[PDB]
Amino acid sequence: GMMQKPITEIIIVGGGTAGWITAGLLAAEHNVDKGVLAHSPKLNITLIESPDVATIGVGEGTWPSMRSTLSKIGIDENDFIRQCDASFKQGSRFINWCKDPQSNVADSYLHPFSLPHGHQELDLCPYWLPHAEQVSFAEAVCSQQVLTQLGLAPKSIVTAQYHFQNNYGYHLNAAKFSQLLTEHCTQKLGVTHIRDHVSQIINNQHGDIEKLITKQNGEISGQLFIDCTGAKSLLLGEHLQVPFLSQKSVLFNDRALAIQVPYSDANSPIASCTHSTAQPNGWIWDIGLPTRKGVGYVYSSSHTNDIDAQKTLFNYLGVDGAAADKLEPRQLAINPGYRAKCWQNNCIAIGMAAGFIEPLEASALALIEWTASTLAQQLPPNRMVMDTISARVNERYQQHWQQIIDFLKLHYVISQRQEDRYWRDHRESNSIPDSLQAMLELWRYQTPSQQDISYKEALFPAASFQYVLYGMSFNTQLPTHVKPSMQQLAQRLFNDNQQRTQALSKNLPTNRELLDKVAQYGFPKL
């Protein structure tokens, strides 16, 4: 019967990166073999996009997962870079997060995308710990600290598409990316595109969504509905009443003031990483695209008004007077948090419809990729068994969100900043999740490790926690009774990292010099 009917009719409500990444990943996984669309494909995928003009952004970052997403969808890296105003991102550099700023005291550390050297052989972190006053964790275990300081790229012009010398994601223009995906998905992957409004959402007798009545395209029936409607969460949050779990009592930030910033020169250097520079009441992001930068101040309205926040943004930009008066930064207000589940009945939320917080550590596109790829890998056979799959997807989703909140909060909690109430408040226990409190206590006595994560395929590996914890000079009790053989392995791996760093520092291009050649010639396919 109906409950045994294969799930083939898939309706995505909303476009943007959330909707089109979903469409592409689903079509590529089920409907394409060796780049060829099946004559009679498994899935019939329709995307209904509002004809209303979308909110504009000023640049967004990704994780290295995006290389895989693009490749799976079937996008050529040169085409992507050229069409989406993209540059290479090798991690996040955190400036002035640790201490109240002093003019003669450098305060910066890197959270690189590269894993610690020799990670398959030995976790170097506890072997580095005794040497913390002599060398940074990131310098000791990876090459990206040194290479990104030098403004160098993660690969050479001779390196194959999506391959690397050091792991990388991207900085990109999201609207241009959505446009590229619309073209690819509709013209090459067989996705049906409808530009219209949804006037009614109709349920069947069991409370599943059965069909949508559009304003001018009639009734669109389906079996699985993807909510990509953004923060309004029209299907999952509103129609299905899935509760929202506010995380503002942890992160505080509920504002962003954003602006695009031209480079001073047509060939100004492009930064290798996202920059995050701490301020009295939040932090400022700085994302370098080839054509310009995107800058924004994330802040807490319960700590500062908007007038003062704007002044802080303008100070960071180095503008005042008449120059500042011509600037038009854009203000957004949110309740940071996530829906209790991403999948209810036959509806799964992807993107902001599921949750959203400040872009610290760039979780937004990573969650889109995770949710879409997971659905594509776990397409339910039918409605009868769907709840077994949605339950386990929801459990993993809940694990991810707990990890995101805790990981982001970690960045604040271990600061030594004292001058501002905002920073002092971030260290108070009522703002620290119990799960993170437990870790902070444990990590006084041992390094973060894979043992701290119970489940498969975490969004952030233990290394990310190490990079932040020790980037910010957190003290961990030294291991005792260290095994000489392992000390010797560690020393070999430290040496090897040093040698690799030196070799790469002499051979890799700057970002702009590389992007110039990508524009003109491109990376090879193989």
Q: Is 15 annotated as a binding residue?
A: yes
Q: Which residue is nearest to Cl ion (CB)?
A: 57
Whole-angstrom Cα distance, residue 524 to residue 526? 5
Q: Which residues, including other chains, have CB under 8 Å from residue 115's CB and lie 6 or more apart?
A: 142, 167, 461, 463
Out of 15, 21, 47, 60, the residue judged to bind Cl ion by CB under 5 A: 60
Helix (H, G, I), strand (E, B) or coil at 129: helix
Q: Which residues, including other chains, have CB under 8 Å from residue 129's CB and lie 6 or more apart?
A: 447, 470, 476, 478, 479
Quickly list DSSP for 94-117: EES-SS---TT---EEEEESSPPT
| Residue with Cβ nearer Cl ion (60 or 107) | 60
| Nearest residue to 252 (alpha-carbon basis) of 38, 125, 421 | 421
Give just the sign of the alpha carbon dihedral 240, 243, 246, 247. negative
| Residue with Cβ nearer Cl ion (60 or 361) | 60
Stretch touching Cl ion by CB under 5 A, among 79-87, 167-175, 202-210, 371-379: 167-175
Whole-angstrom Cα distance, residue 277 to residue 94? 6
Q: At its nearest, how many Å lie between Cl ion and the CB of residue 358?
A: 15
| Residue with Cβ nearer Cl ion (57 or 116) | 57
CB 160 within 8 A of CB 525: yes
Whole-angstrom Cα distance, residue 476 to residue 447? 7
| Residue with Cβ nearer Cl ion (237 or 329) | 329
Helix (H, G, I), strand (E, B) or coil at 279: strand
Whole-angstrom Cα distance, residue 359 to residue 165? 26
| Residue with Cβ nearer Cl ion (57 or 64) | 57
Q: At its nearest, how many Å lie between Cl ion and the CB of residue 397?
A: 24
Task: Please work out the total of residues on this chain that contact Cl ion, with binding judged by CB under 5 A.
Answer: 4
Q: At its nearest, how many Å lie between Cl ion and the CB of residue 285?
A: 12
From the candidates 42, 89, 176, 232, give the one annotated as an active-site residue. Answer: 89
Backbone angles phi, psi at 417, to 5 degrees: -60, 135
Q: Does 230 bind Cl ion (CB under 5 A)?
A: no
Q: At its nearest, how many Å lie between Cl ion and the CB of residue 177?
A: 8
Q: Is 118 annotated as a binding residue?
A: no
Whole-angstrom Cα distance, residue 226 to residue 11? 6
Whole-angstrom Cα distance, residue 392 to residue 468? 30
Whole-angstrom Cα distance, residue 48 to residue 228? 10
Q: Does 174 bind Cl ion (CB under 5 A)?
A: yes
| Residue with Cβ nearer Cl ion (141 or 313) | 313
Reply yes or no on whether 506 is catalytic.
no
Q: Is 198 annotated as a binding residue?
A: yes
| Nearest residue to 231 (alpha-carbon basis) of 139, 333, 319 | 333
Q: At its nearest, how many Å lie between Cl ion and the CB of residue 186?
A: 21
Q: Is 361 annotated as a binding residue?
A: yes
| Residue with Cβ nearer Cl ion (75 or 410) | 75
Give just the sign of the alpha carbon dihedral 380, 400, 244, 21. negative
Q: At its nearest, how many Å lie between Cl ion and the CB of residue 296?
A: 11
Q: Per residue in 202-222, is it b (16+ CB within 10 Å) or e — as a string? A: eeeeeebbbbbebeeeeebeb
Q: At its nearest, how many Å lie between Cl ion and the CB of residue 182?
A: 15
Q: Does 57 bind Cl ion (CB under 5 A)?
A: yes
Stretch touching Cl ion by CB under 5 A, among 22-30, 112-120, 172-180, 373-381: 172-180
| Residue with Cβ nearer Cl ion (86 or 129) | 86
Q: Per residue in 133-143, is it b (16+ CB within 10 Å) or e — as a string? A: eeebbbbbbbb
Q: Is 17 annotated as a binding residue?
A: yes
CB 152 within 8 A of CB 505: yes
Q: At its nearest, how many Å lie between Cl ion and the CB of residue 17?
A: 9
Name the binding residues for 7-chloro-L-tryptophan. 89
Name the binding residues. 15-18, 89, 198, 361
Residues near Cl ion (CB under 5 A): 57, 59-60, 174
Catalytic residues: 89
